[PDB]
Design a protein around this nucleic acid. Structure first.
Ligand code: UTP
Ligand code: MG
Ligand code: MG
Ligand code: ZN
Lengths: 277, 79, 50, 49, 1350
DNA sequence: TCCGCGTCAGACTCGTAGGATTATAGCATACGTG
DNA sequence: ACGTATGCTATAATGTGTGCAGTCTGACGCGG
């Protein structure tokens, strides 16, 4: 029989009313006043019109079946707000809705990174201006060449072209043959390997040794300011909250702790060795 | 000891239980800082553990007795 | 992949990668040239009355 | 493969029968394929595409 | 973190919600400029957690001061990014959706449970037709489909009283209503009535599914998903490139298809839209869900940007490219490097060159470690810079750690275990690795640009493992065959041959030396050749009765070279071994001898020294490749010119019209074939003993010192087969079709090929190298297949306590004994007390190893047949005993318990095939005198007076003086014997003679020929000649036959002078020989015949070099247990044969056993001939028909030791054809695994019952408790399983999905709710734990006593 | 249960090489947070 | 106020289709 979801629906619309001028008015007049059955008919009837409009709006974002669904929602909003009293036909008024609802739904579900309408709307005029120029320049227009025709900013044109930059999936064959994908190459940013992990562990254990090698009040005041041993990274003025309660004596003792520690790095073999780093 | 490990397999038997006994002894000298029985002659734990097994100083029974002999000294002493 | 006796004069019997893409890829013969329609053709000395 | 017509035969589709079933196939440069093929009972069939 | 098992059950909508930490309700990935998650989107941080380690989005709570604080504004927790791959999500589906894996993954599962087909369910899903859920009014019954017409009829007429709905909603309600308790009992009742095969199969499978479903705790509603889980965003990444681009996984794209359509359905259900639209939306939603789970399955896979299909979920678990094979069993590994290898002829066996800058980077954490110890580095970034600057004193530290540290060297491909060996690295300045020449054999590593991977063993255990197990010195012999794989090759062998080989007088003949040192003195002094006969005095050391060595001093007449080689020879072997001219074949015995006598150490040394002196003296020889070295024989142009005129003669006879094209084609091949062997032998006869021109007095004859010959004779490179192309004749080439060219190539490589001779050489060259690339995959795939089934086998027990085994005989095929009994029954614990001929004193015990020295006493006593304790005869549940396996051939003594055999066996079998990728048998000549002894023979005397054989598998023995089988041959059907049965023959006598390119059909009776069912055009054809008119008849088969004469069998019926039939002596069978297809017949109808005349001649075209290309498939089919298309019939139970009833030639058989009262009938074809002729004493499983034997037929009847004997012989036959050496125990491993499952026949104490097929070990453990408790025994019948199926049978589903069929394995395991408790290696390698075998055997069993202790 | 035809499952192992898309109006009040 | 989002316009128009088609040996699973 038929096991394609496409042909099945396309069959069901093929057995649905095809309304006359005066028929549309009869149903529509009752549809506004809520006849229930009337709203269902006008809709069922003009599903055929939605498909013909979705035959041109394909190959842009979603599939043909995805365009019809959202194209049907436009016919529904057209039925929710049609004027039968006006002598003008329905097929005319409904087309404005079905073309709109489709374009809008493509603008959202086309890009992975959700691009709102404002940045997109403008991008189109920049691209459609590129058409005019390309045909008469016979040269794909630059960011400047587009900016000189619109008389608009350089960075705007450039930043709008940056958002046009599309994606390559991390699961995309490299070389058009089973070999390796981008995931088998692209490294992990967050976690750096043991060598970088042990750097900080060994560097920060060496400091725990260097602090117990300083003065009792010098490693208290120096550590609790930077937030090394304490809980919160305080300032020269804020070390007074603890027991210091001083502004001059805290600053002289902080730097006294650092000067004795600078000689501890000159002797152990760092100082200018670990200055490049 | 360095080339051959057959002389070491002669003593224990199982090639697999030899690696386990030799590893456990290698770890005692690596961590505990235990003394080597055979002159080390600038060889790493690997080789020395094999030498003691090869000549016949290290065994499954030997190491288990020696373990609880240090641990039973601690028992009587604590309480 | 196998060498076909048509290759004579047209395609080289000994020119092809030894990888899974072995018999498909092939260099053109020295004096070989394309037929006006598409096939290959090879030069030959005509013998007239011996 | 050069377009036009081509005659082939699976020297034993069904080695059950072991019958050499002959088939023809029109290969275009652009367009749909047109195949003709026999069967165990030598009935001529056509399978477009 | 430390667990016991892994479970698989069905994800309940309620269960999916437990993992999910939120509901993704939008497709929005991130904001466009602010690269951050969107509100309840696919990367939402409110659902999947925060971005960085402890940071909320808006930035209100930072790092660990706010440990687990939940932000107000954004609503995001402050935990590690850890949770972004752990936290999941879900989507509330407006309408329920069906799972593709419980619909399309056959069996239907959802349809198998409902007792409903596929079509029916799908047409419900896509809204084509409604389905009844439950009809109150019994008018409409359940699971009755109603078209859109038929739903309306019942609505107004009946209505309400019938509940039927459409879409995935309906089928869920059908699954939710069905009762598993009642429909289980109903099926059991229908089973008691009248049960068939298919009916009972279907019922029992449903029954078990229904019971399994109830005991798994799964509910059939979960087959439909109300809730859809979302993968963590980190596992479907949206990460930015360095180039300002982004990249997303195809899952994110597939997810946006699901959420969009699902939210659009919510919108349409809000609008109360017409159903026609709602239908499309529901079909779409299903399309999206099915595409997310498994894209390419239901229909066209949704293609994306680059016209390629989107990678779905299932795809990341599926096959090679899945997680299992690619990102779990195979891994890129640290402390690893690879580089071009080059030779290391200075190294010892336990050494290998390692570049400095390589080992530098490899041992990076070991430098930083030894640096902090010495106090040179205070910290590690300090040590990092010390290494970077490459300062002088850092090299000396690196050099310190590496000493007494092994490194692993791997070469691709890794065939067998020896594909990795460990050495002690030697730092060398240069980017090349230097490898030891002798172990090059194991890797198959050619220095032609090979690369080898390096790996550093980190842990002390890995350093011990590498030195103990994987060291090159501890790995000598192959595990496949008890044979040294580190045998010297090429130059080494050539150099020794040069040394030992002798020559006439030369410089300093017959001199007299103090020792082998004076021989080196005189040779290198320039006053003796290595080829001088000399009476030297050498002192050999022979072992005595104990361990002490006896010294013996004597004068040996040998050469200067032989004397110098004795220096390399350890003291313990006799001198007679180096007294001969040494070759590759002789050298292989030197190392084996050395091994069996002295031990391991002596051999490693010996092996190296042999190699070193081999290369050195090979280079001293000056051995070169001049073009005068390629000597063409004197009279090549004399052989060919007149062998051409020979072929020109028949060419003129053919055009006259006598010798046919086919006969000429075979006749010209035989002329060229004789000329080719004529040139080949004239060449070597002029080349082997070219040195006929010597000195001394006048002359002497001697071996030729032609450079190329020495290089072939020594066994260094090439052979007599290669030299043929060089100096002799190229030989006959083969067309790409398979037919051989009538005119071969006359020229050679020295003379130069012409333009075509090269064009012809191409055809053979390209196809030979095409099978090097393509055919390698079948053999490598076999290695994979073998391994998986043989993963679990490990030596578990020491002694299984069983006194069973399989008997082994000597392989004496093709005159010369192919494989001696000593070698076959070597290193295998016996199962029976085997003494000497005279039964009056035992010599060998039962439970004892057979050493080469104990096997030497088997030769003295000449053992007949031996019951060796085999693998399959083992009773050890889950593994085998060390006694059953016997010696580890790689080691050289009894196998360790814990060593993982199965994998060692699989490797040994697949390794040769993978690396491994003259039928003029006219007459048997017997060589020793003997009495002729035929067996399985039924012959008949002919008109001529000659014993013609009319039986297919006739064997011919050669019985000696005392009465034992020395030689054995295969005499074929219709062969003419010189002397019949029991008669004496002399040596060098043609005892049998026949035509090879023909299979005659010979009669058993005399009279006239009748034509039956031989209609011209339908069944046969006819072709006549001239003047007189001799016509031949050619029988057409089903290929060249019309539909008219298909069930007509063509046969040449025998009749007498009157016209009646002639009965075959002592049978009620009228004489009728059925002719097969393409059978050529010369006698037409109405011709007188005697007994023994040939009726027809069936062609036997068989000229394709099987090699390994056309021989590996046969191995696979055996292992895979695929029944042939013409299996042979065997008797079931012993008793009296009694021939019964018939059906238009189709023979039955009413066998009535002596004890068994109930008869047994089985049907037989007409054209097929039997071996027995009725009314006979048949035993269990007698040869009734001829042809291929079905492996299932063998075990079913003749037990375990019969099917094991079959596969082992059959497999080895193919490998022996190639000279591949494999111990039978390795095949026996796979055989054992192929006998894993077994069907039960009889009800037991446990709820086994009939139709269940359980593992053999589990059911036998139940029999252990049964013989103790009594109760009801569980009788059984062992079944044979193919490799591909035996792998998917193991209780471990993890091991099954890791193999193949991964989509099916998981679904069957989910529905069963099976929990894998892990035993196999694949299982623990995946989870990254200790292998429950080898080194880890001692550990895993110490955890098993934790379980036992309470 | 048996024989033809449909779909669906695999395809020896490691190294190296390089690149690019189309288009979704146009303007005026409605909905969300400093 | 700035950014995002929702809304309306009225000639008539009313049922889609597109795209690789010497792969292959082997194995079931629904009908017939
Ligand atoms: O596709 C291929 C081709 C070749 N090889 C491997 O590369 C090597 C190429 O062939 P070798 O040069 O190693 O040959 P060989 O030593 O066995 O014999 P001779 O040349 O001495 O006659 C062999 O060891 C082969 O297994 C592959 O692994 N794959
Ligand atoms: Mg190579
Ligand atoms: Mg080589
Ligand atoms: Zn926040």
């Amino acid at each position: 029989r038929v096991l394609d979801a496409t042909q099945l629906y396309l069959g069901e619309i093929g057995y649905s009313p095809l309304l006359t001028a005066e028929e549309e008015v009869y149903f529509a007049r009752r549809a506004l006043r809520g006849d229930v059955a009337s709203r269902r008919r006008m809709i069922e009837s003009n599903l055929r019109l939605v498909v013909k409009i979705a035959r041109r709006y394909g190959n842009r974002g979603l599939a043909l079946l995805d365009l019809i669904e959202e194209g049907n929602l436009g016919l529904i909003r057209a039925v929710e707000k049609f004027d039968p009293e006006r002598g003008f036909r329905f097929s005319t008024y409904a087309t404005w809705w079905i073309r709109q609802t489709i374009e809008r739904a493509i603008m959202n579900q086309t890009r992975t990174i959700r691009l709102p309408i404002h940045i997109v709307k403008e991008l189109n005029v920049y691209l459609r201006t590129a058409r005019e120029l390309s045909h008469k320049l016979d040269h794909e227009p630059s960011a400047e060449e587009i900016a000189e025709q619109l008389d608009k900013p350089v960075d705007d044109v450039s930043r709008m072209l940056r958002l046009n930059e599309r994606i390559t999936s991390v699961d995309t064959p490299l070389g058009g043959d089973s070999e390796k994908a981008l995931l088998d190459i692209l490294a992990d940013e967050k976690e750096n390997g043991p060598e970088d992990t042990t750097q900080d562990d060994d560097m920060k254990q060496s400091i725990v040794k260097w602090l117990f090698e300083l003065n009792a009040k010098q490693r208290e005041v120096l550590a609790r300011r930077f937030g090394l041993l304490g809980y919160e990274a305080a300032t020269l003025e804020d070390v007074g909250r603890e027991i210091g309660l001083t502004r001059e004596r805290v600053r002289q003792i902080q730097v006294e702790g650092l000067r004795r520690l600078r000689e501890i790095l000159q002797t152990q073999g760092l100082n200018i060795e670990a200055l490049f780093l | 000891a360095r080339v051959t490990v057959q002389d070491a397999v002669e003593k224990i038997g199982n090639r697999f239980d030899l690696v386990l006994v030799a590893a456990r002894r290698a770890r005692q000298m690596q961590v505990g800082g235990k003394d080597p029985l055979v002159p080390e002659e600038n060889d790493k734990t690997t080789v020395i553990a094999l030498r003691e097994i090869e000549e016949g100083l290290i065994n499954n029974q030997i190491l288990d007795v020696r373990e609880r002999q240090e641990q039973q000294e601690q028992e009587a002493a604590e309480l | 992949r196998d060498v076909h006796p048509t290759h004579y004069g047209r395609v080289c019997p000994i020119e092809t990668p030894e990888g899974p893409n072995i018999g498909l890829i092939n260099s053109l013969s020295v004096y070989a040239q394309t037929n006006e329609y598409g096939f290959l053709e090879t030069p030959y000395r005509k013998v007239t009355d011996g | 493969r050069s377009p036009g017509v081509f005659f082939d035969s699976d020297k034993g589709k069904t080695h059950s029968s072991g019958k050499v079933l002959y088939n023809a196939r029109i290969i275009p440069y652009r367009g749909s394929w047109l195949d003709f093929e026999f069967d165990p009972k030598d009935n001529l069939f056509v399978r477009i595409d | 973190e430390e667990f016991d098992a892994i479970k698989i059950a069905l994800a309940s909508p309620d269960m999916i919600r437990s993992w999910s930490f939120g509901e993704v309700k939008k497709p929005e990935t991130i904001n466009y400029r602010t690269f951050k998650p969107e509100r309840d989107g696919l990367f939402c941080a409110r659902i999947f957690g925060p971005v960085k380690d402890y940071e909320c989005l808006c930035g209100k709570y930072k790092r660990l001061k706010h440990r687990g604080v939940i932000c107000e504004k954004c609503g995001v927790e402050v935990t590690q990014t850890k949770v972004r791959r752990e936290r999941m999500g879900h989507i509330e589906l407006a309408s329920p959706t069906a799972h593709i894996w419980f619909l399309k993954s056959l069996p239907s599962r959802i349809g198998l449970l409902l007792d409903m087909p596929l079509r029916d369910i799908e047409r419900v899903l896509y809204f084509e037709s409604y389905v009844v859920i439950e009809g109150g009014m019994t008018n409409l019954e359940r699971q009755q489909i109603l078209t859109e017409e038929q739903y309306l009829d019942a609505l107004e007429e009946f209505g309400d009283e019938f509940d039927a709905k459409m879409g995935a909603e309906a089928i869920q309600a059908l699954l939710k209503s069905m009762d598993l308790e009642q429909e289980c009992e109903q099926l059991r009742e229908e089973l008691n009535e009248t049960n068939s095969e298919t009916k009972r199969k279907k019922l029992t499978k449903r029954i078990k599914l229904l019971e399994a479903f109830v005991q798994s705790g799964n509910k059939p509603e979960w087959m439909i998903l109300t809730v859809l889980p979302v993968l963590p965003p980190d596992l479907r990444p949206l990460v930015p490139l360095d180039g300002g681009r982004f990249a997303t996984s195809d899952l994110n794209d597939l997810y946006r298809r699901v959420i969009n359509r699902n939210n659009r359905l919510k919108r349409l259900l809000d609008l109360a839209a017409p159903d026609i639209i709602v239908r499309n939306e529901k079909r779409m939603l299903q399309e999206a869900v099915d595409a997310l789970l498994d894209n390419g399955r239901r229909g066209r896979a949704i293609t994306g940007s680059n016209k390629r299909p989107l990678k779905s979920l299932a795809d990341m678990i599926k096959g090679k490219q899945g997680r299992f094979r690619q990102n779990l069993l195979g891994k890129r590994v640290d402390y690893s490097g690879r580089s071009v290898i080059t030779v290391g002829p200075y190294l010892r066996l336990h050494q290998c060159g390692l570049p400095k800058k390589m080992a530098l980077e490899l041992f990076k954490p070991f430098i930083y470690g030894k640096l902090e110890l010495r106090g040179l580095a205070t910290t590690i970034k300090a040590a990092k810079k010390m290494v970077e600057r490459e300062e002088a004193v850092v090299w000396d530290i690196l050099d310190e750690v590496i000493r007494e540290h092994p490194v692993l060297l791997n070469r691709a491909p890794t065939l067998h275990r020896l594909g990795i060996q460990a050495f002690e690295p030697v730092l060398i300045e240069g980017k090349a690795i230097q490898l030891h020449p002798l172990v090059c054999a194991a890797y198959n590593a050619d220095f032609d640009g090979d690369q080898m991977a390096v790996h550093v063993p980190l842990t002390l255990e890995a350093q011990l493992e590498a030195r103990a197990l994987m060291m090159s010195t501890n790995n000598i012999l192959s595990p496949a065959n008890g044979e040294p794989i580190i045998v010297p090759s090429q130059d080494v062998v050539l150099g020794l041959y040069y040394m030992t080989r002798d020559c006439v007088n030369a410089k300093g003949e017959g001199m007299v030396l103090t020792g082998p040192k004076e021989a080196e003195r005189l040779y290198r002094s320039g006053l003796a050749s290595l080829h001088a006969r000399v009476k030297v005095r050498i002192t050999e050391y022979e072992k005595d009765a104990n361990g002490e060595l006896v010294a013996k001093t004597s004068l040996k007449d040998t050469t200067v070279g032989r004397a110098i080689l004795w220096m390399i020879v350890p003291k313990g072997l006799p001198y007679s071994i180096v007294n001969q001219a040494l070759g590759k074949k002789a050298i292989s015995k030197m190392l084996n001898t050395c091994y069996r006598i002295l031990g391991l150490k002596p051999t490693v040394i010996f092996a190296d020294q042999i190699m070193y002196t081999g290369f050195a003296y090979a280079a001293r020889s000056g051995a070169s490749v001049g073009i005068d070295d390629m000597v063409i024989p004197e009279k090549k142009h004399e052989i060919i010119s007149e062998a051409e005129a020979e072929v020109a003669e028949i060419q003129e006879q053919f055009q006259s019209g006598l010798v046919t094209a086919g006969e000429r084609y075979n006749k010209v091949i035989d002329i060229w074939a004789a000329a080719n062997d004529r040139v080949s032998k004239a060449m070597m006869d002029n080349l082997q003993t070219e040195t006929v021109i010597n000195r001394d007095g006048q002359e002497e004859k001697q071996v030729s010192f032609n450079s190329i010959y020495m290089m072939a004779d020594s066994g260094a490179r090439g052979s007599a087969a290669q030299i043929r192309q060089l100096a002799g004749m190229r030989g006959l080439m083969a067309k790409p079709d398979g037919s051989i060219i009538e005119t071969p190539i006359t020229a050679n490589f020295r003379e130069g090929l012409n333009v075509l001779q090269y064009f012809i050489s191409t055809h053979g060259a390209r196809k030979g190298l095409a099978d090097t690339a393509l055919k390698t995959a079948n053999s490598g795939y076999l290695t994979r297949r073998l391994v998986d089934v043989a993963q679990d086998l490990v030596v578990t027990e020491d002694d299984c306590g069983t006194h069973e085994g399989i008997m082994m005989t000597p392989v004496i095929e093709g005159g010369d004994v192919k494989e001696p009994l000593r070698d076959r029954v070597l290193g295998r614990v016996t199962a029976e007390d085997v003494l000497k001929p005279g039964t009056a004193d035992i010599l060998v015990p039962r439970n004892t190893l057979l050493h080469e020295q104990w096997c030497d006493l088997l030769e003295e006593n000449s053992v007949d047949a031996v019951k060796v304790r085999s693998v399959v005869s083992c009773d050890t549940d889950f593994g085998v005993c060390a006694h059953c396996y016997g010696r580890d051939l790689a080691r050289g003594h009894i196998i360790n318990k814990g060593e993982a055999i199965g994998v060692i066996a699989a490797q040994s079998i697949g390794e040769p095939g993978t690396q491994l990728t003259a039928a003029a048998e006219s007459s048997i000549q017997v060589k020793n005198k003997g009495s002729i002894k035929l067996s399985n023979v039924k012959s008949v005397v002919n008109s001529s007076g000659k014993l013609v054989i009319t039986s297919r598998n006739t064997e011919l023995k050669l019985i000696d003086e005392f009465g034992r089988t020395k030689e054995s041959y295969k005499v074929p059907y219709g062969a003419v014997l010189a002397k019949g049965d029991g008669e004496q023959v002399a040596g060098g006598e043609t005892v049998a003679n026949w035509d090879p390119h023909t299979m005659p059909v010979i009669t058993e009776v005399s009279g006239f020929v009748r034509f039956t069912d031989m209609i011209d055009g339908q069944t046969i054809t006819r072709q006549t000649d001239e003047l007189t008119g001799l016509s031949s008849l050619v029988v057409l088969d089903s290929a060249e036959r019309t539909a008219g004469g298909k069930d007509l069998r063509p046969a040449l019926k025998i009749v007498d002078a009157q016209g009646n039939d002639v009965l075959i002596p002592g049978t009620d069978m009228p004489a009728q020989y059925f002719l097969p297809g393409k059978a050529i017949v010369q006698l037409e109808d109405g011709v007188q015949i005697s007994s023994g005349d040939t009726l027809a001649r069936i062609p036997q075209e068989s000229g394709g070099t099987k090699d390994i290309t056309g021989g590996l498939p046969r191995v696979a089919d055996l292992f895979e247990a695929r029944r042939p298309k013409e299996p042979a019939i065997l008797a079931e139970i012993s008793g009296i044969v009694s021939f019964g009833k018939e059906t238009k030639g189709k023979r039955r058989l009413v066998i009535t056993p002596v004890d068994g009262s109930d008869p047994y009938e089985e049907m037989i074809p007409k054209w097929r001939q039997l071996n027995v002729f009725e009314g006979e004493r048949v035993e269990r499983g007698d040869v009734i028909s001829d042809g291929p034997e079905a492996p299932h037929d063998i075990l079913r009847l003749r037990g375990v030791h019969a099917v094991t004997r079959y596969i082992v012989n059959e497999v080895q036959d193919v490998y022996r054809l190639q000279g591949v050496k494999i111990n039978d125990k390795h095949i026996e491993v796979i055989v054992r695994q192929m006998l894993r499952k077994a069907t039960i026949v009889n009800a037991g104490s446990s709820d086994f019952l009939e139709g269940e097929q359980v593992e053999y070990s589990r059911v036998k453990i139940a029999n252990r408790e049964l013989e103790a408790n009594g109760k009801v025994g569980a009788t059984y019948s062992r079944d044979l399983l193919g490799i591909t199926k035996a792998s998917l049978a193991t209780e471990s589903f993890i091991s099954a999905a890791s193999f193949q069929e991964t989509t099916r394995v998981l679904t069957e395991a989910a529905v069963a709710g099976k929990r894998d408790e892990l035993r196999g290696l694949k299982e623990n390698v995946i989870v990254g734990r200790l292998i429950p075998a080898g080194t880890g055997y001692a550990y895993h069993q110490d955890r098993m006593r934790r379980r036992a202790a309470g």
